Amino acid sequence: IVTPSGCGEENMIGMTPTVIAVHYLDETEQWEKFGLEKRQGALELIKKGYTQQLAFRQPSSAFAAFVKRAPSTWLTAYVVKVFSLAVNLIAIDSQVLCGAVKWLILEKQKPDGVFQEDAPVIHQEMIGGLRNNNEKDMALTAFVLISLQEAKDICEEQVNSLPGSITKAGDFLEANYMNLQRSYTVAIAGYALAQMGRLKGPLLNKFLTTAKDKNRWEDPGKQLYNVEATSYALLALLQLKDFDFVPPVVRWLNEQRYYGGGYGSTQATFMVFQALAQYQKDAPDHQELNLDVSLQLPSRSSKIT
Amino acid sequence: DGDEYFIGKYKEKDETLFFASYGLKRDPCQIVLGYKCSNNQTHFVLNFKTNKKSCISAIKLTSYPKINQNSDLTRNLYCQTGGIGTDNCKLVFKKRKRQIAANIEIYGIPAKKCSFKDRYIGADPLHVDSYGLSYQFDQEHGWNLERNNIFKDTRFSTEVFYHKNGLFNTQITYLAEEDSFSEAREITAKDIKKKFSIILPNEEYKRISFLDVYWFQETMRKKPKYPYIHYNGECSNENKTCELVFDTDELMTYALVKVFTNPESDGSRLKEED
Amino acid sequence: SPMYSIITPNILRLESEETMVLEAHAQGDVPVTVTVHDFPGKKVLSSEKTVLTPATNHMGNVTFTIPANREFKKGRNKFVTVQATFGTQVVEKVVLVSLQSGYLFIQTDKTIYTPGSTVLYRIFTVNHKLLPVGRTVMVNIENPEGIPVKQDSLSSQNQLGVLPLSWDIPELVNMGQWKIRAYYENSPQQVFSTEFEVKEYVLPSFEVIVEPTEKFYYIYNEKGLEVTITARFLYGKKVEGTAFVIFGIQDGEQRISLPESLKRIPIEDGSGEVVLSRKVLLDGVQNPRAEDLVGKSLYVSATVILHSGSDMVQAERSGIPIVTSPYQIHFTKTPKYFKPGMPFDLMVFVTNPDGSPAYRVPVAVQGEDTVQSLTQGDGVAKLSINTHPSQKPLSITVRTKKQELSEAEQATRTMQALPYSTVGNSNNYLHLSVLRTELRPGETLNVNFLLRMDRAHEAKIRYYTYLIMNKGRLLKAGRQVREPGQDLVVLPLSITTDFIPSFRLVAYYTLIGASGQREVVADSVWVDVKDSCVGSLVVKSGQSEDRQPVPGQQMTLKIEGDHGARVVLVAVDKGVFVLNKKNKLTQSKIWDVVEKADIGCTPGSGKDYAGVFSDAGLTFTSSSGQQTAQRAELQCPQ
Ligand SMILES: *[C@@H]1O[C@H](CO)[C@@H](O[C@@H]2O[C@H](CO)[C@@H](O[C@@H]3O[C@H](CO)[C@@H](O)[C@H](O)[C@@H]3O)[C@H](O)[C@H]2NC(C)=O)[C@H](O)[C@H]1NC(C)=O
Numbered sequence A: 001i002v003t004p005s006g007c008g009e010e011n012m013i014g015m016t017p018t019v020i021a022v023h024y025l026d027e028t029e030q031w032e033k034f035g036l037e038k039r040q041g042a043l044e045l046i047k048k049g050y051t052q053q054l055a056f057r058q059p060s061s062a063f064a065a066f067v068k069r070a071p072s073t074w075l076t077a078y079v080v081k082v083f084s085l086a087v088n089l090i091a092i093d094s095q096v097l098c099g100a101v102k103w104l105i106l107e108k109q110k111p112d113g114v115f116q117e118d119a120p121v122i123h124q125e126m127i128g129g130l131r132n133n134n135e136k137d138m139a140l141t142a143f144v145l146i147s148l149q150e151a152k153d154i155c156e157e158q159v160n161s162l163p164g165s166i167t168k169a170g171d172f173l174e175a176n177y178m179n180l181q182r183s184y185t186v187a188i189a190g191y192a193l194a195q196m197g198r199l200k201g202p203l204l205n206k207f208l209t210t211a212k213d214k215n216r217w218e219d220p221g222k223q224l225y226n227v228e229a230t231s232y233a234l235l236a237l238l239q240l241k242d243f244d245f246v247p248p249v250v251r252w253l254n255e256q257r258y259y260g261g262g263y264g265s266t267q268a269t270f271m272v273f274q275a276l277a278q279y280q281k282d283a284p285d286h287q288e289l290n291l292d293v294s295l296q297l298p299s300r301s302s303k304i305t
Numbered sequence B: 001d002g003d004e005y006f007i008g009k010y011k012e013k014d015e016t017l018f019f020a021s022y023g024l025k026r027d028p029c030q031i032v033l034g035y036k037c038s039n040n041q042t043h044f045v046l047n048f049k050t051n052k053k054s055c056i057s058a059i060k061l062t063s064y065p066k067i068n069q070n071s072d073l074t075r076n077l078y079c080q081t082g083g084i085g086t087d088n089c090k091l092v093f094k095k096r097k098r099q100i101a102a103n104i105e106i107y108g109i110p111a112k113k114c115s116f117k118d119r120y121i122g123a124d125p126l127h128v129d130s131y132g133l134s135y136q137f138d139q140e141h142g143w144n145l146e147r148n149n150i151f152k153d154t155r156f157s158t159e160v161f162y163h164k165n166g167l168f169n170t171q172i173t174y175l176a177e178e179d180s181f182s183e184a185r186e187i188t189a190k191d192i193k194k195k196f197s198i199i200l201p202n203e204e205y206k207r208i209s210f211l212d213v214y215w216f217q218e219t220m221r222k223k224p225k226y227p228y229i230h231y232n233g234e235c236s237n238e239n240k241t242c243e244l245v246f247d248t249d250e251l252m253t254y255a256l257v258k259v260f261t262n263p264e265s266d267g268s269r270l271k272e273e274d
Numbered sequence C: 001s002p003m004y005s006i007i008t009p010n011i012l013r014l015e016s017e018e019t020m021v022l023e024a025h026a027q028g029d030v031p032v033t034v035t036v037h038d039f040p041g042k043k044v045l046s047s048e049k050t051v052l053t054p055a056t057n058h059m060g061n062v063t064f065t066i067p068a069n070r071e072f073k074k075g076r077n078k079f080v081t082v083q084a085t086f087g088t089q090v091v092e093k094v095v096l097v098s099l100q101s102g103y104l105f106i107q108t109d110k111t112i113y114t115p116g117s118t119v120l121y122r123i124f125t126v127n128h129k130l131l132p133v134g135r136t137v138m139v140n141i142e143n144p145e146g147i148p149v150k151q152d153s154l155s156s157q158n159q160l161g162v163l164p165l166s167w168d169i170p171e172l173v174n175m176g177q178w179k180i181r182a183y184y185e186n187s188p189q190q191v192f193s194t195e196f197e198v199k200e201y202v203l204p205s206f207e208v209i210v211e212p213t214e215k216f217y218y219i220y221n222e223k224g225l226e227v228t229i230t231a232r233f234l235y236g237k238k239v240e241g242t243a244f245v246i247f248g249i250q251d252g253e254q255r256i257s258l259p260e261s262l263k264r265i266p267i268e269d270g271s272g273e274v275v276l277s278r279k280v281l282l283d284g285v286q287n288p289r290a291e292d293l294v295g296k297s298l299y300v301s302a303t304v305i306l307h308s309g310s311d312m313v314q315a316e317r318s319g320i321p322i323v324t325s326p327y328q329i330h331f332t333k334t335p336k337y338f339k340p341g342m343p344f345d346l347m348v349f350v351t352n353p354d355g356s357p358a359y360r361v362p363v364a365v366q367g368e369d370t371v372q373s374l375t376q377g378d379g380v381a382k383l384s385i386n387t388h389p390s391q392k393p394l395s396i397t398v399r400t401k402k403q404e405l406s407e408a409e410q411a412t413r414t415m416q417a418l419p420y421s422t423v424g425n426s427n428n429y430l431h432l433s434v435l436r437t438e439l440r441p442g443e444t445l446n447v448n449f450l451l452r453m454d455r456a457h458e459a460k461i462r463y464y465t466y467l468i469m470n471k472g473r474l475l476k477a478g479r480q481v482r483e484p485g486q487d488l489v490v491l492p493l494s495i496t497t498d499f500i501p502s503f504r505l506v507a508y509y510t511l512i513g514a515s516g517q518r519e520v521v522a523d524s525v526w527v528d529v530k531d532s533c534v535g536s537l538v539v540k541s542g543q544s545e546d547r548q549p550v551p552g553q554q555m556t557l558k559i560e561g562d563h564g565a566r567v568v569l570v571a572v573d574k575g576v577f578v579l580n581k582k583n584k585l586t587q588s589k590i591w592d593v594v595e596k597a598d599i600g601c602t603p604g605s606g607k608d609y610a611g612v613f614s615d616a617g618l619t620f621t622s623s624s625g626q627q628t629a630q631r632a633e634l635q636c637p638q
């Protein structure tokens, strides 16, 4: 729980952990040992931060740190995803988010379907995995595609090019999955492709064999990357509904016991918490069991089923 | 193996409303989970009704022992009230002196996405219709033909009526080989009244050439009273939106329509017959 | 400044009626809107509006009904956020909902069955008002191993609470304790049980009871233990036969028999006289000290054979206690907190050491003198002791001054009491002490509102608001003015048939603690009523008791009951009670089930006002920020 204060960029850093904690508690049904309506104050501060973010609105129906500064594509996608994930507690602006989605699709995207950013964010802590300038373009495209698919459930009646942009991005990233070096980008690209269902065959090989030790997508520094990639894997498996590899990685997750804290350890925490929330929501208490047991007797004509 | 009678299309990814084995020689049945019977020498009626927010998708009855009689000569299963797409139907099945047992499973799908467009279309509808039978054409005029292996009935001249797996089917009027299938439309239960109409595009590449209708309807008797489906006006090139009205003696439960388009069509199709 | 607060029950049930109370301390017509919406999140369930009346001093006689929702469903339990707004300010609180939507009373026609018969049972689906309600029930019949052999699901819509079901026992079946487990369709954890025998038996022709002249046992008896045999036919006549009597000791999960005390006696005209000598009992065990038998009970197993050698009636009076003192003291219905300065009455429950209440027995104190009382039919005595005004804890024991008895046979037990945490050291308490008598419907109870404030601000308490909590609901509310100069007021409450089995009478009033600051002083007292029916259902014969009934004859039964009630009859032989009298339906069982499911277990007067209401089962919240805790389970701890 951190008080939301600062500029447009700083408000996200201030109020993101409270938002992720509130959603995780809501989905996990573990509110009984958190404070007995501390959610009231948490959501009041969240609404205050939402009003502060709205105060820096731009004519393009997007959001940014400065009123005069052009919005960033990654920042717009992150804001859209965060506001779309919170559509069950408080009222959220509908037309503004749809306009931001249309601006991202029609303007901040090449005709081939590749999204390109022009204004990098001021702060260097919330960038996450984009610090290394090796595969920035396709990583940005995948993140934008994920945010757009997350927001697809509402703004479809206001955007008509969204299915076309999604198809273009998926068909373009299908052929680029074999030319990736860093591991966590491989994981996130696999998750993005599996979101629609374009992760099958040799791609899974790169998810299984190319990964180091089949469970850790480690990189020099930024340990959170690992769990981030971990979460991606779970989501992909949860999209494919496979129980072969999920329990071991879930058990490995609990051995870390990380709850944020540090320099720019916010985006990864949000992604892992939302992945865990989806995991809890989708995974049943058991595995599928539906038997249809019949028997036949040489003395009875009917089949007893 | 057993005699399997089908209403609707089976789906492998859905759940069953219930499943019970019924002794057809019992008088009366056992009320399982709260559903009533009516058993006679010639009839077996199940007044099933569910208490879940879902709509019936299919019904399958398996009769024992297997008796070598074709199922397409007449009709055996039908929901007298309601039917497929509703939450309950009065399911009537006619028995025989040899059949002594039955096994009834009924499937339902969530009422939210209560649609059948994903199962009656198949992969390629261009050559295969909803019945799963291939299309046959004649070289006399390069058009379609007629099938004579299922249950059919006629009332007036040039009237087509087909009944298979609880599906009632009609074609107006005939289809050419070179025509390209465009799309399809569905009608839910909430949009169904005693009389209703449709509006379809008839401009540029969307010129109407051939239409087909598949539906599920109720019966008050073993012999049904077919709805009086007739086209109103002329689907000419001038009127941009063509319309079609339906007059029903018995209330319908589901409706599916497929659209066939050909810009080169003249808007009229009829053989040189009188 | 105008002052506002909320009064709500600690737990509310789905598909029922709940009542909250509002008070204004703000004369004037002010509307209040109460909104119930689900938790977690903000999704609306219900909304009600009501305007207060200055002429009525603004009591909240406002109710709501929680919707019969369906998406409430697994995982951890669920909470509900209840909100109130009197136009200008907002007060909300978290409350717990209960899957225990009601009670299911499964009653079978018998207790023991044979393979090849029919189990007939009725499920009575009541709600927390013991009233018929329509729900859906899932019933399972479990074998003695623990796996169901049949399951069913019925509905109680327009059935008036009676769900009659049946089951056929196969002729090739397993013998033992068969179970019926029925629970509401919405609550899979609300399992109600009914265990019945399946055995290969035959009807006994008489009941034998073995009764002691002294219902306990004493270590230092110089004569022995005398038990007598009453073998009477099930139609109330007298027998002629012989009997075999053996004894034993009821240790931990075992039974030790004494073949030396294997006696045979002639039952002389439905009577026997068996004497167990002390030497035989001493020789039964190998303990040099008899005092080591304290804490263990004996059992007498008798078996009476008729002179015809026909029937075989083995009866056991298990649990004959061996105690130095024949009286045992309890603190079950006595609070664990004492009131300094205020006289602290104690609810004394002295009984025979196996739970049966005593009678005409006094109570004594080590230091106090000349103070004694008497025990009425229920088994509760009364006393009054003045307490130390300081913070010294009080630990006292109950002694007995019964005549014709030795001073070494007086029981004792140390009791721990904790001082109340008065806010601001105001020394302001509350005591709703009631005179202990036999409470009956249609009578008047003179409830006393004991008061102890200071002369500085005693005259500023204009009125007292009392609330009655019965079966976990606010039964009634009321007010009584308190003019200055009065230290005691009496409320002649007309106790009706709706106060059964008990009622927590809690009282609350506002206060200012030493500087312009809001406080609430409140307390509740446990009051129990004699446990008769809420209605009046009796059965008798319409004849004039001319002569005895004869087999095959008709009698015109007379049944007296309510109007619009559905009475179900069951005629069952007492031979099943001979073979197995366990698990029988009685109104006392119904009231015990209610009490075990009641929201309160501690008598009241907790550490603080929040503890006071937690014991009383209430949630108070106001704009000042004062709030109580919450509980998530269904039954009280331990
Ligand atoms: C054998 O039993 C079946 C039922 O299991 C009988 O079928 C039922 O027959 C009755 C009377 O013929 C039909 O009732 C009709 O109801 C309409 C409603 O308006 C009414 O207008 C008609 O005049 C008639 O009373 C009922 O619909 C029918 N049920 C089905 C499912 O067909 C059958 O008649 C019996 N055969 C015998 C007794 O020979």
Ligand SMILES: *[C@@H]1O[C@H](CO[C@@H]2O[C@H](CO)[C@@H](O[C@@H]3O[C@H](CO)[C@@H](O)[C@H](O)[C@@H]3O)[C@H](O)[C@H]2NC(C)=O)[C@@H](O)[C@H](O)[C@H]1NC(C)=O
Residues within 6 Å of the ligand: B232, B233, B234, B235, B236, B239, B241, B242, B243
């Ligand atoms: C496309 O529309 C065609 C014409 O519409 C029908 O006919 C007349 C116009 O020809 C419509 O208006 C009527 O005009 C009359 C004067 O001729 C008026 O007296 C009358 O009150 C009415 O206003 C009429 O509403 C419309 N329907 C009918 C049933 O007449 C039609 O002929 C074509 O079939 C249609 N194309 C389709 C249906 O595919």
